[PDB]
Amino acid sequence: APWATAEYDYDAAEDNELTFVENDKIINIEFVDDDWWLGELEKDGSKGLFPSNYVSLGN
Numbered sequence: 001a002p003w004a005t006a007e008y009d010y011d012a013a014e015d016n017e018l019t020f021v022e023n024d025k026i027i028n029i030e031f032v033d034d035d036w037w038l039g040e041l042e043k044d045g046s047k048g049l050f051p052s053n054y055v056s057l058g059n
Contacts (some may be wrong), residue, residue: 003042004055005026018048026055 010021012019018041020026025042032038032049040047 001030003059004029004039004057005059006054007056008054010051010054012048014049016032016048018046020050026050029057034047 006022006024006026008019009021010019016041018026020041026039027042029037029039035053036049036051038047038049
């Protein structure tokens with residue numbers, strides 16, 4: 001369960017999707033799918049699906 005940084009801004013288009021901006025951290029990443037992962041935002045505790053190509057693990 002690693003954390004990641006936000007490479008690009010990603011806007012959720014669904015209720016179960018996380019919304020975040022570049023440089024936000026996403027924590028407790030769960031390998032739900034090869035392309036999309038489920039995590040939680042460091043900044044507010046919200047949880048949801050996020051696309052992997054928008055983040056990079058670690059700092």
